[PDB]
Symmetry: C3
Subunit: 410 residues, 3 copies
């Protein structure tokens, strides 16, 4: 007959036995303070101090750091040899990391050879694109997860408790409930964030940063994912070997010659800027306060000063947790799966959530009806970094160790 459930964060109240409600829309980038002495209905001399502090909305974005985007120049060169294969010779652009070579091998001809070359069906002409004058222009991050929150601190008498409350969650105590309800549509999973400078100031949102196909001229075309090594873009155009009697062959390329950075700068007003305050970069995560004062969320504060609220998640069930295994990747939009061994006592069943967390950041959660004794629970998550040890958690309680996920993009 009993069916305990702690997935409800909130309270049951009797509207005539509630003493105070605050209900308001609050600028997302503003704090709010409420201070009041709660006094007995002219029917005593014992007041209770109420002090509520709500901090500015923070955004937390789990990301994959994509490294730096580069500007550069596309150069074209020609190399000719009357005799020999194309592997027999070293070309100038061979040291250039990003290059495109077209080999006109065993194709020497009368009206396309230089004067000293009586060759026919021999040798090699080389047309050769390369990127040079490379310069990093910004740091890019792929959005994996977006979560907004406010830190909420409530003092009621001598009770004092602070919690970080996620948007669309509630702070619950015996005498005070604080619920935050909101929506924001500025950032989307999959968006790529570009920071041009030491941009504790702002950046740009790109909705079409190249991923599976990068061609020269695309946003994100020339990337260096770490300190060294480029992920080079494609050059989809064609070469032409321009021929002439007694003259060295000359290469042409008929594709786009303008870098992605220049093309984007040329129409920069087409792209959306965002601003930031009190940034905090950590590995594969960015947190900040968005100072956009046009955005608001809804706050509701309910206070009962005598009889306790009915905490809707109250239960006698007790949970023990340890990790069993993990699969999948950090820094990945596909994510990972953490397998937990979860022991339930003091209840026949318990409907709750088991979370994958590390250092008080949670990356995934699974709702589950546990049965008395041992349970195996798989938790899907996204985010984290190579040093993350994902732990199995219930409420504020976590396993003693966590597990590392695998790296993405291997």
């Amino acid at each position: 007959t009993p069916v305990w459930n702690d997935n409800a964060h909130g309270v049951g109240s009797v509207p005539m036995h509630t003493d105070l409600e605050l209900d308001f829309s609050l600028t997302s980038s503003s704090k709010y303070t409420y201070r009041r002495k709660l006094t007995n209905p002219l029917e005593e001399a014992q007041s209770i101090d109420l002090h509520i502090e709500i901090e500015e909305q923070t955004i937390g974005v789990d990301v994959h750091a994509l490294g730096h985007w580069f500007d550069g120049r596309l150069n074209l060169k020609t190399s000719f040899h009357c005799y020999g294969a194309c592997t027999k010779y070293e070309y100038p652009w061979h040291t250039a990391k990003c290059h495109y070579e077209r080999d006109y091998q065993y194709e020497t001809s009368h009206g396309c050879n230089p004067s000293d070359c009586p060759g026919v069906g021999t040798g090699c002409t080389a047309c050769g694109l390369y990127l040079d004058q490379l310069k990093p222009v910004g740091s890019a991050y792929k959005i994996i997860t977006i979560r907004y929150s406010r830190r909420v601190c409530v003092q009621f008498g001598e009770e004092n408790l602070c919690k970080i409350i996620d948007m669309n969650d509630c702070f619950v105590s015996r005498h005070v409930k604080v619920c935050i309800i909101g929506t924001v549509s500025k950032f989307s999973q999959g968006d790529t964030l570009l920071f041009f400078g030491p941009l504790e100031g702002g950046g740009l949102i790109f909705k079409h940063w190249c991923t599976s196909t990068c061609q020269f001229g695309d946003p994100g075309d020339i990337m260096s994912p770490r300190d060294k090594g480029f992920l080079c873009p494609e050059f989809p155009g064609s070469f032409r070997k321009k021929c002439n009697f007694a003259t060295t062959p000359i290469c042409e390329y008929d594709g786009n010659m303008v870098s992605g950075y220049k093309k984007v700068m040329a129409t920069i007003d087409s792209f959306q800027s965002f601003n930031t305050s009190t940034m905090h970069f950590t590995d594969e995560r960015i947190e900040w306060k968005d100072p956009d004062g046009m955005l608001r969320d809804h706050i509701n504060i309910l206070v009962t000063k005598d009889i306790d609220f009915d905490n809707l998640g109250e239960n006698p069930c007790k949970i023990g947790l340890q990790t069993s295994s993990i699969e999948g990747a950090w820094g990945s939009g596909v994510g990972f799966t953490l397998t937990c061994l979860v022991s339930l006592t003091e209840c026949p069943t318990f409907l709750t959530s088991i979370k994958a967390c590390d250092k008080a950041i949670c990356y995934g959660a699974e709702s589950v009806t546990l049965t008395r004794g041992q349970n195996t629970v798989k938790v899907s998550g996204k985010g984290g970094h190579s040093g993350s040890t994902f732990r199995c958690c219930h409420g504020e309680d976590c396993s003693q160790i966590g597990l590392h996920a695998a790296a993405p993009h291997l």
Copy 2:
């Protein structure tokens, strides 16, 4: 003077004449049960049984089934003839559904003909790309509409009523109101969902699946919309006829040679996975429960145990409905328009909504102030399938027949 309106789903209450409020944030993937005996303020011996069951959030997505995505290999072949036009000969890739042919017709030359060919300005060389080693790798669906809901069941005494309540709608009864408020930003209209296997497990979200231009290497490049017949991608590159004295011409192609499936797999961590539970595929619709336990919505439950709520949509107006005509398409982001003949009696005017529905799924709605007597109301909708008969509906009441819309992509 009267202006009846049933577009408000909710209640008017007197806060001192309300007996119970439940207000909480609930894990989207969790159910919730509340059971209580409501007893008279120590001032009787007559209790009322309250039993509330809230089911897990379901997502319902109206889609267009795009058929299967394929992996494959791009092959290049050459075919030569000394004499004759290019239509006079059958080429090997002619049976290949996806191919690209370049005809070098009437262009035979001394240093590009085989030994047995003294031809000049004659015959034909054929360069010919074709896709082969094709394999379906998944089933794709274009999102047309996304709606979330929870089934809500309320027993109050002997009253017993269950309703599917859409997110941001309310359950309304004489003694109980249940409102659900939430937001989710995981899926977007226009997204394409890819299921790789029998994926009652999960899939991937693609935000840039090719539509008006599919080139080889794009996500969605090789599609078969039904059992047979491919929608073939473009091959944007160039051929080169490589010539040599007394040697057969040899074709080259300088465009991308890597399939979209391989390019996507090569950077799979760039794409967003989602998970599913208790899926239900029907024609052009997918329903499931998202087990992402990080998501929450807000539930409010208000109970008056003695005096009835004021139902804000209460009215004496009576509606009769029939379809008149339809235009437009199912399975289409542009949609359809259903024209309804709507008779109003017992009121001079009535502000309400008329809906286009079939089998208790609604695909569109129009708010309208009806006037006494006959009205013509056009309802815009999206979704459905070739077997859908869109009916004109008001509340839970529908016309006796519905109409079929036209197929998309004709």
Copy 3:
């Protein structure tokens, strides 16, 4: 010790000293009216008239007008000269605004010259693409900002006040609070809206309208940003000079030949339509009422008929405002920054928001704790047009003049 703050829009109430609550989900495209005489608890003969009118949800979109999209035909022509450079001759497509020329200069050859041309390494063959049969097919607008609102009018006794209330903001008066809570996910910043006709009817949403790279065949490929002058698309394909003995060279082009409009029409069901009612176009802004009756928002109305609500933003602080400078652009996703000189009196500090507004439309806001005396406040904004004079505002109070921002896309 004092810390005044007016960023909270809402009220503090004592649930037993509140007389009426209306809580309901309302069709977004519907109005709502409430009329009632509030009478004293059978304990007087003095009623108060309550009359509430809530208007249909309006959307306001700040945009950049992109001008017209065109359909057209890609034509290819050849021009030959036996002798002379390619600048020495005028080509037919020189008057065509959108063209692609390939010059085969100083490349005359025996098996590629016409009969009257004994030239070798001389003259010029011209292959030349041009767009013609151009026709405007619609007007495009880039979304910069999306905001939804409802006009709310409340009469309480002789008090009468109307306000436009943004979604997720509250109407606040001494006796009545009206809060609107909602979410809509139909439009996104960066989306491009296409109107095909005099489309006070509807349009299409494009999520991938070309910006930094437009190739022929893309949505948005051929644009005229104003009355005259085209932004021409790229032609990424290659020309081929097809040669023959004693015959004039003939050009070919192996890239896409189908316009973006035709490609989009060919798969129009892949794109999302929206409908509109009572449109209002102004420079760089579009407002309308979305008649999609499937969408809803949440309305809460709380009334105290005797004792006033505690207005949570009540304060004695007084603000004076003037503009100091501006940088940045209207019609731009990057936006502008308005610098304001703000004088605070009657308080040591004041937490509030300063806004950049013109003609009662606000384009940006900054939350700030002002200190007594002079303050410099920077407000980031987006939207507006060349005639906008962005003013510094606090609540409904604005500076005497505003400043113009710079044009985008210079």
